[PDB]
Design a binder for this molecule. Structure first.
Ligand SMILES: [Mg+2]
Ligand SMILES: [Mg+2]
Ligand SMILES: [Mg+2]
Lengths: 247, 246
């Protein structure tokens, strides 16, 4: 067919019922354009609340999960719980999980496999740090992260890859369109060489890292950029602008 | 005297149907006025559990982070816990320390922030088998408690929970004497390092294996003030554990 544009909003650790409820009302009233898939990832305490308040046109994602269905893992949640709350996606391998919390590639792979086996979709995050970019090892870094993810994916129809260069997260330093395109094209080439043409052609690779209303149109114009995983702007009315990046 | 305290840690178990069924049975139970009961659901169900549980049972989160909002994908803050109607958070649980590698420094920062946002804290401590066998039970639990105490101004909203991690999946089994031994030392630690008033007023609850069959003997120990219950908290015998002071 042709890759459906994908816009995810990662609220991170922000919001309460009152102000997230006001956010959700605004999103509910927005017209979601054709061939566009919108997903919001609330704080874990509000997955249920957000699913109840959001229009079904918008899917709900968890911001993380663990790798078994139930167990002695105080503070964690499972894909089963996520499904049970009406959510259909999980974000895995986010930069903050890797770099603030130290989650290993191996662990992230195990979570991807479990989440997929349980019937969730996965937004799987990769990305290099400034020091890695400056050393010229971007490709090595992101290919290695992608490989561990791929080793644990048996159905790519339920996966979206999110490239979020760590130097672009929370800094205002959005990748230029050319920079995002360069990495996205390389990641798609990796899928083609290492999985299949069909998987390469159908898998959304979305860009994250200071996506704003002012920058989204030029980014979305790049041939191998299939949408966004949005951070700070996901909490504001300009998220709707980003949803309309191809209009 | 110290009010008997029974927490149920559901860990990463349950869905709306079976947790809703568990809650129905808890609402039906006579919760004694002399016992403080708290349930800690999985984080996806804090809100659900608070909405379904009778006000006689308080709700706790199983963890939180150390600032009120921020770019911490997968975390929740004390403000969110409070906003969901929960009034406690469990911090420093053995699984957070030993499966997920949370440091004492981070646990102390979480303690300070949680208390600053008006939550109660169930602060967990405990030594692993290799620490016990190296003779450093005391150094380990005292240093854990010191970090906690360094981040507590008002102990009225804190409960300490001792977890004999050395008896978890090691093939070792903790006796009531061994529980009492540690609890008595922890109270002595508070007396000498914080104040006698804090030592006498602070609940120190037992976070090792407890069941309906064993709860009365454990609760009879002079320095055991209740329980942070694991697996039995999902079962009918939790109602009996709630009645273990009497
Ligand atoms: Mg990595
Ligand atoms: Mg160089
Ligand atoms: Mg070919």
């Amino acid at each position: 067919p042709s890759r459906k544009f994908f816009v995810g909003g990662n609220w991170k650790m922000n919001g309460r019922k009152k102000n997230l409820g006001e956010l959700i009302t605004t999103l509910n009233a927005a017209k979601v354009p054709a061939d566009t898939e919108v997903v919001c990832a609330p704080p874990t305490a509000y997955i249920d609340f957000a699913r109840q308040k959001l229009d079904p046109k918008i899917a709900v994602a968890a911001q993380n999960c663990y790798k078994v269905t139930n167990g002695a893992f105080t503070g964690e949640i499972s894909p089963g719980m996520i499904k049970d709350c009406g959510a259909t996606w999980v974000v895995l391998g986010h930069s903050e999980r890797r770099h603030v919390f130290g989650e290993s590639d191996e662990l992230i792979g195990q979570k991807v496999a479990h989440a997929l086996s349980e019937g969730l979709g996965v937004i799987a995050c990769i990305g290099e740090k400034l020091d890695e970019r400056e050393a010229g090892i971007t490709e090595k870094v992101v290919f290695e992260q992608t490989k561990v993810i791929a080793d644990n994916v048996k159905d790519w129809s339920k996966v979206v890859l999110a490239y979020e260069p760590v130097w672009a997260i929370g800094t205002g330093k959005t990748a230029t369109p050319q920079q995002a395109q360069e990495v996205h094209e390389k990641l798609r080439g990796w899928l083609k060489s290492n999985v299949s043409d069909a998987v390469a052609q159908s898998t959304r690779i979305i860009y994250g890292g200071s996506v704003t209303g002012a920058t989204c149109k030029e980014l979305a114009s790049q041939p191998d950029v299939d949408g966004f995983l949005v951070g700070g702007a996901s909490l504001k009315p300009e998220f709707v602008d980003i949803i309309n990046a191809k209009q």
